[PDB]
Write a protein that binds this ligand. Structure first.
Ligand SMILES: O=N[O-]
Ligand SMILES: O=N[O-]
Ligand SMILES: O=N[O-]
Ligand SMILES: O=N[O-]
Ligand SMILES: O=N[O-]
Ligand SMILES: O=N[O-]
Ligand SMILES: O=N[O-]
Ligand SMILES: O=N[O-]
Ligand SMILES: O=N[O-]
Ligand SMILES: O=N[O-]
Ligand SMILES: O=N[O-]
Ligand SMILES: O=N[O-]
Ligand SMILES: O=N[O-]
Ligand SMILES: O=N[O-]
Ligand SMILES: O=N[O-]
Ligand SMILES: O=N[O-]
Ligand SMILES: O=N[O-]
Ligand SMILES: O=N[O-]
Ligand SMILES: O=N[O-]
Ligand SMILES: O=N[O-]
Ligand SMILES: O=N[O-]
Ligand SMILES: [Cu+2]
Ligand SMILES: [Cu+2]
Ligand SMILES: [Cu+2]
Ligand SMILES: [Cu+2]
Ligand SMILES: [Cu+2]
Ligand SMILES: [Cu+2]
Lengths: 334, 334, 334
């Protein structure tokens, strides 16, 4: 097909955990969906202690934004590496076929840009990440990863083939960081990316993250930035981890329908308490809220969640159901 | 519904790996199932070396007991924290909906008790664990976790919808402990829980357990406490890990039907050699024994199993089948 | 049945990643399939630095060869431990039932041999490994593991029950090694296996591999030993990990049909980007190539892949499809 005959639509991405506007069931035929991302290397404070790292980002955020298209659309990405950056970057889409997911075609020095097109031939949520030859995990574990959702053209389906329609969607990107430590266990600091590289590699080779965070920082999805829902709403949470396994869990809830490895032609797993998203994967979980209050959404290695940062909150509005749960006798001394 | 109109049944729990009496197919309508657990903080010897830790337990054991109910029963738990304990505790049921699984409603100081009720709306095996705000992984990794099984009212089913009926059930709780180590690699010891806390946190943050055990100690499910079966018996092994991934395997056997993530509305995986139970999950495996002798049941990270403690035994009685396996030429020099 | 009435066929195994000749759909009735393996303890250089370890091998390779039979064939293995070796060895087949998978029946000192027969009653890919009582993980993590494929007699099937036929098969064995390190982080060296044992155990207990490799060494499946395919060919990649989780991913491709836990009576997962093979398991992924060029096949913990060794290449021949992917604007300064 002459791709020039297809509709084009442009999207300006939004910052995670929010997701750009889209339609679950495709309202048009196949399209070329145009996205632009600008790489930004920047300092980021990642913890309550004030630890500051040199992050490598797509569009200024960790994770990079969620892109949403439909099966057999074309994704056309304009990738810009401004001359204010220092490093070489590129992009690999796990949704794409060929050329290392695009990485072989998108190497951009500071001051350069490129435009890649690929056909989104498989439905699912997928990781995308930077992957410059010879320094792949350094870029990924500096925050340079996000996800893309390729919806079936007729939307999501349950294990029986019936429609599933979400009311709200959130994108949780989970990031393992490896801040180098000295003999004393203290964080080390670096003056240039080149002076950082070897100790960054050494720290990565411990296979022990110093931080594991949602949305780029300890506590990022809490407080005024807690996720929200109302009782009775259907919520899809897309969760990615570009480098390391995670095991998401909604404390006080479930995954009613879970694609743990993220690919929508498969039936979902039902009624999950916790699910395994392998490193290098995006998964998706659908839940209908049944109770109000605070929930925690965590990686259920609870050390990873509550000591290293992999925990966020939902604040849910509505009526309490005493049939589902009640305090029969409140805590007391007798 | 007026819950007061429903039958009540009381259960006194039994110590793992055994499971209180129950019926697979529900012989009554929905019920309120009453359980009582008493929290016990106690010293436990966890290895052959004599390493002694301060454990935090439900009902005196690591893991806590297995509770068994049916879908849409109500679980009513009386949780007692005697004044002989030091710490605040609570309980979160992954089977439950709302209030952080119950944790927000069950905070009990020493000298207090509480009664929680919830509706068991989803069938499966699920983790339960203590989760006091701000010190969650310390309690969990001190042994304060167990599991609950919510059976479908018509019992278990295979991948074709045919009944599966177990003859025996065992509950294996797998516990990761993080005993703090000094520069020399020697275990450190502590005089009060408060003096222990920071080094407990530091040890947890290594993400490297010092011990990984079944039923609370190295070798606990061996010798006079080996699990048992006869050739031809159908055995369900429920396995939980509240904090960290495991990969169970029956050495010399299989999981004929496995719910690796524990939720019975899903078809089981067939013929598994090894399966992944994510941290924060309970799974269940069904096997019909076909050969007698000793089996080892392990986490198949074999270092975790044979060096760190995650190994137990079955002793199986009956007739050897030489069709299935035989020594054609016994080991010899020729 | 009188097994003596069945056909016998002998196989001389081939070195991974290649696989001995076989037929997907069984062209005969059940057979006794005869294999011979000779244990070889040998020095192996495992990295670009020249690090040399004392490996323990089946048939001279890491991994050991892939054996291929059909469901309800009998496997008859002659296992030889020549008197040029130092250690006791045996073999445990995860495909087999009874006697610890064969390990209880196959203990051979140097100078001894044995012949084991078992019935391959379950279809799938399965791990086999050495497992001498008391020193199991040392042998496994010294390279003494491989895999066996038990094909359904009517070959592989998709999620709808339609045939899947591969054109090429490769076997990737992934090995975690634990070379002991001193305080400085330098590798230690040893003069005898007995003098090595305690520090080998200590290194294993870190749960942090020093090396994670395909086919026995960093870069083994690259260069002149890259895997190969043509556009349009259907390739099955069998992947095993006897001790530790992995998460395979074809960079630039997918797993079109994946049995992540390796058992062919289950429907495959479709369209996977990345999949979790638990330690102690073999999995299999089927892909039809659609683009030419270089691919990397990796464990998608990218530190594990690109720093520790778990990366190989495919070189794929054929026509580039610009519909599927194209550079619209090559990298440039504007
Ligand atoms: O609209 N994306 O930068
Ligand atoms: O980029 N990770 O959330
Ligand atoms: O910001 N110049 O590419
Ligand atoms: O900028 N190099 O493709
Ligand atoms: O169920 N909270 O870990
Ligand atoms: O929306 N619930 O009151
Ligand atoms: O909760 N009232 O005892
Ligand atoms: O009967 N449970 O303590
Ligand atoms: O509590 N864990 O077995
Ligand atoms: O043991 N008094 O709660
Ligand atoms: O005892 N406090 O809920
Ligand atoms: O199959 N035993 O590890
Ligand atoms: O029960 N078997 O002889
Ligand atoms: O096993 N008899 O040589
Ligand atoms: O033919 N196997 O050594
Ligand atoms: O033996 N492992 O590739
Ligand atoms: O090589 N003698 O067994
Ligand atoms: O060589 N011992 O079975
Ligand atoms: O998609 N390469 O990591
Ligand atoms: O085989 N492809 O030109
Ligand atoms: O790729 N041509 O600008
Ligand atoms: Cu980059
Ligand atoms: Cu990738
Ligand atoms: Cu507690
Ligand atoms: Cu929990
Ligand atoms: Cu051996
Ligand atoms: Cu094994």
């Amino acid at each position: 097909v002459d791709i020039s005959t297809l509709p084009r639509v442009k999207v300006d991405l939004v910052k995670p955990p929010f997701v750009h506007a889209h339609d679950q069931v495709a309202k048009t035929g196949p399209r070329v969906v145009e996205f632009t991302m600008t790489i930004e290397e920047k300092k980021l404070v990642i913890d309550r202690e004030g630890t500051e790292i040199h992050a490598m980002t797509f569009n200024g955020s960790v994770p990079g934004p969620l892109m949403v298209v439909h099966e057999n659309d074309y994704v056309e990405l304009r990738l810009i590496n401004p001359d204010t950056n220092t490093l070489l970057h590129n992009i690999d889409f796990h949704a794409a076929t060929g050329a290392l997911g695009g990485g072989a075609l998108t190497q951009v020095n500071p001051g350069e840009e490129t435009t890649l097109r690929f056909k989104a031939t498989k439905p699912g949520v997928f990781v995308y990440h930077c992957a410059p030859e010879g320094m792949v995990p350094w870029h990924v574990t500096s925050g340079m990863n996000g996800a893309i959702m390729v919806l079936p053209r007729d939307g999501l389906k349950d294990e029986k083939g019936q429609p599933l329609t979400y009311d709200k969607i959130y994108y949780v990107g989970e990031q393992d960081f490896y801040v180098p430590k000295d003999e004393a266990g203290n964080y080390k600091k670096y003056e240039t990316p080149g002076e950082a590289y070897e100790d960054a590699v050494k720290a990565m080779r411990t296979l022990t993250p110093t931080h594991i965070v949602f949305n780029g920082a300890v506590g990022a999805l809490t407080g005024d930035h807690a996720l929200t829902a109302a009782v009775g709403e259907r919520v899809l949470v897309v969760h990615s981890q570009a480098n390391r396994d995670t095991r998401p869990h909604l404390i006080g809830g479930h995954g009613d329908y879970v694609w743990a490895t993220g690919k929508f032609r498969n039936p979902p797993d039902l009624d999950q308490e916790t699910w395994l998203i392998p490193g290098g994967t995006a998964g998706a979980a659908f839940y209908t809220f049944r109770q109000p209050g605070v929930y925690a959404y965590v990686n259920h290695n609870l050390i990873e969640a509550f000591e290293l940062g992999a925990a966020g909150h939902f604040k849910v509005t509505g009526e309490w159901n005493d049939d589902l749960m009640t305090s029969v006798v409140k805590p007391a001394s007798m």
